[PDB]
Amino acid sequence: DRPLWLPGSEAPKWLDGSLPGDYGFDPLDLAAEPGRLNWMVQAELVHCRWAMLGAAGIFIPELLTKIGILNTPSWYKAGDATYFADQGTLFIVELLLMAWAESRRWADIARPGSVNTDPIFPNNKLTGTDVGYPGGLWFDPLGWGSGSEDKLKEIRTKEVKNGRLAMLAVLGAFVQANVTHVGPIDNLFAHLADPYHTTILQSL
Amino acid sequence: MTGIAEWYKVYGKSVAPDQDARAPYYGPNRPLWKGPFTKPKDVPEYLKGEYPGDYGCDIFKLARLPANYARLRTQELMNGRWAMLGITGCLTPELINSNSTPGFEPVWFNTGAQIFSDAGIDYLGINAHSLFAVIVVQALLMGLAEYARIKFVPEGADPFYPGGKTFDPLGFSSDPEILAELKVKEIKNGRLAMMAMAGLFAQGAVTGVSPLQNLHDWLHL
Amino acid sequence: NDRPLWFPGSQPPEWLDGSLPGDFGFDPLGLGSDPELLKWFVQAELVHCRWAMLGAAGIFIPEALTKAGILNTPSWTVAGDQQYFTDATTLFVIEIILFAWAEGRRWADIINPGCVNVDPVFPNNKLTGTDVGYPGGLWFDPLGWGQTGDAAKLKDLRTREIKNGRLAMLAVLGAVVQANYTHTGPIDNLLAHLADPGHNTIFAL
Amino acid sequence: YIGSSTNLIMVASTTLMLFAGRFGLAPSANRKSTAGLKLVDRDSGLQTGDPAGFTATDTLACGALGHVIGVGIVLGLKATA
Amino acid sequence: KRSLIFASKQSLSYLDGTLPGDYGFDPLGLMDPEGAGGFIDPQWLPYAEIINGRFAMLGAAGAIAPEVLGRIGLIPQETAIPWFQSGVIPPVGNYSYWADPYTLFVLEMALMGFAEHRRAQDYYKPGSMGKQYFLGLEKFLGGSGNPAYPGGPIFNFLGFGKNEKELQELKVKEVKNGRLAMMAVLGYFTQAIFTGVGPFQNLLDHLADPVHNNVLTNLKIH
């Protein structure tokens, strides 16, 4: 039917053919129970989108810092720099603003098509019909995610794949700076210099 | 009905006729190789439970052919019985006396080079260094027992459970039910002997010290 | 199907019937009784035989060409403990990564024949092979030979390959054990054996 | 202490008493002794998983008497030798 | 039909399975209805078991909670002390609270009396605590037919056990956890005497070197 993670195999029954990025990769059957599949697809959507943003703040800064256009600190040292606010205050402000946005999304997931109206002004509405893809003039200012179902799967598939790669990259940076005690981009430009003696094994 | 055959204080599962000594270990309601986590996907459709020690573990699908299944069962029984004797023969020497001061050896895996060099085999503390005078005798004696076992089945006795008067002199198998459970007991103790043997081989290969001294080091320290 | 046997005066095992290449009814232990296990075993035989062909070549030809010729490889037994472009404990991982792909494709072929006959990148470069253990295509049989339509010449060539391969397996096992014991290379040991066939043997250690 | 003579004596005494009680060589809950020291069977009313009829009370009694006898032997062997 | 631990012919006559934790374990025949009396009778022993078990659940999860929370480091370390050093036994250890432990004991006796006497009066005379005026909330403390399970708007405010099957299973779970907590508190006491350190310290000592840190090695007291 479709190219799966393994060339010779049979896709799990629950992952029939529908969701974007569907490749029948579920060895552990972590979405076999009915109803859990909807939760997981939303969960992966959230992580990947966060990871995309998190990778652009871990590599692009260091990308245009090592060559030098910004002079920003490293990703793993930005947690101590003094900013106009306080680190603790910034944490709490995030927590409440995150609470509002996360809570609005949670209500959408639990009851689809119930949080589609602006509270302050009950005239502005959010254009969205698929859970996890809410449009409107804020999230979708260009109308690039509405129309034929065919293009929806393409762009959605493009979205998740870049996201899956992004999640993997950020996991690297985390562990991969933890043991090497050096920046990610520095590792890249040290791996293309002497590739055969700059490997995971030679870092213990 | 015969010598220590009415001796019904060894059953293992039955205070009374409430069980018939074969209800468990056989049939559909029997213990399986993953306890209550054996939702049927790996329990095949040929391991119904007619044979002793059937726990429904055929991951690699070796016994899917009924003829091969019988051969494997016999082969399991034979390494099983020999393993039982071997582990007993590897431990009892080192529960009676110890230390390799004379040409004696308390270590199971160092008793075989004992004759080869220095002295000869000195039972508990039959000499010289002649290999091919035990070898021939053992080869001759085993070849004929080996040969007399693969053949000479009296008329209809199981070639692996003869149960006559020379192999079942004590008559434990007079009652069919007590033969059914004793077979389970035999195979299960045999499997334990085999795992113990693999432990001795692996532990000797790694640690290189006598198995009981390994236990003493592990427990005491 | 009467045919030459490993042991002339024996009844061939029932499961073997001579159809497989190199089948001489040599199953004294009755290991390949189950048909599926027999299939797995023939694949294992083919892979070991080819790897042993390569190993025998790389063990003897350089060592045949050191006592003469030009190539002075000091030994194959101490060849591992040397220096190269890359270190050993990471060359191993590089090899494992490079081989995982091909070994997985072959595994999938064994479990599901035909599913791994297409090039993943370009869906046109097929392999054109319906017999397991012999893909063909253009990476494995580039120079035409490998197929004969509907005939038995291919079976003869298959038997030739199997037999050369079993010889190579035995030779490489001999290389390993005889290097371990004789503490010396294979080719000079051959020369010494030729010098004194009688006294120079497996007993004059 | 595991290989000590005291440990060996105590283990042997307890094991021997448990064996005697379990295999009908000593009085138990279901094994009454008459005036002639012959063992007759009685219904103590205690259900046990032991096929022979060894109960938890039988186990406790046999262990207690085995410990008593083992302590006696240990102290006697210490005082004498 | 059920698991039997050490049942007997006598015990199984009156232990049939109605009670949640009923497994026939009555080697002493303490719940025989033939000789029911004051406190040794079928109506009181299950209730006493439930109450001892509930207080033991609070005890086992309370005698070790401050020590665990101080080990993970979120309560002050001076409040992260073994249970016996919290003023319950002043000789082994004492702590200075807002009131001396005898004033605290008098306050505890007053409050627990107001609660416990009402519980008793509902046990002896069911429904008698929902009639007389009690600060206007006597209607919440009415209880049900079973003294051990009032299940009112206060004692059951998340409303578990809507159906009878889940209710009974939850009863069995409560009884099992209570028996476990009772045995755990007995272990706390004996280990406090024999070791001199808190239960979590004993657990960590056993987890560190199990073969040299156990009852056999540690009946040297100190």
Ligand code: CLA
């Ligand atoms: C193709 C197989 C092959 C061949 C041609 C040789 C050839 C030789 N070996 Mg090696 N060897 C082999 C396999 C082989 N070996 C294997 C499998 C082992 C492991 C058991 C050994 C272990 C070994 C040791 C330990 C020693 C030799 C030695 C020798 C030499 C003297 C002969 C001898 O002692 O035979 C001994 C042979 C055996 C013990 C096993 C029999 C060999 C195979 C199984 C049977 C023959 C197969 C086939 C019919 C031969 C066709 C040959 C054809 C091309 C003419 C000679 C150069 C000795 C040496 O270095 O002398 C200078 C020596 O010390 N070999």
Ligand code: CLA
């Ligand atoms: C909830 C039951 C429970 C649990 C989990 C433990 C656990 C432990 N006890 Mg405590 N103990 C208990 C009850 C319990 N005990 C009771 C009732 C008593 C009074 C008889 C004691 C008296 C006691 C002493 C005096 C000592 C321990 C010690 C220990 C440690 C094990 C080493 C040892 O010698 O054990 C000995 C264990 C016993 C003497 C009691 C065995 C019988 C009881 C009923 C426990 C049965 C456990 C059972 C499997 C249920 C576990 C529930 C759950 C974890 C699965 C370990 C932290 C030792 C320690 O602190 O090491 C540093 C130590 O010196 N315990």
Ligand SMILES: CC1=C[C@H](O)CC(C)(C)[C@H]1/C=C/C(C)=C/C=C/C(C)=C/C=C/C=C(C)/C=C/C=C(C)/C=C/C1=C(C)C[C@H](O)CC1(C)C
């Ligand atoms: C079941 C199954 C199922 C699924 O399907 C899969 C799986 C899981 C894989 C599987 C598994 C398997 C296994 C585990 C097996 C094992 C085996 C063994 C261990 C054997 C032994 C076996 C063992 C044996 C025989 C033993 C023997 C012994 C002997 C001879 C001995 C000898 C001796 C001695 C005495 C000592 C002295 O001084 C000397 C000598 C001479 C040294």
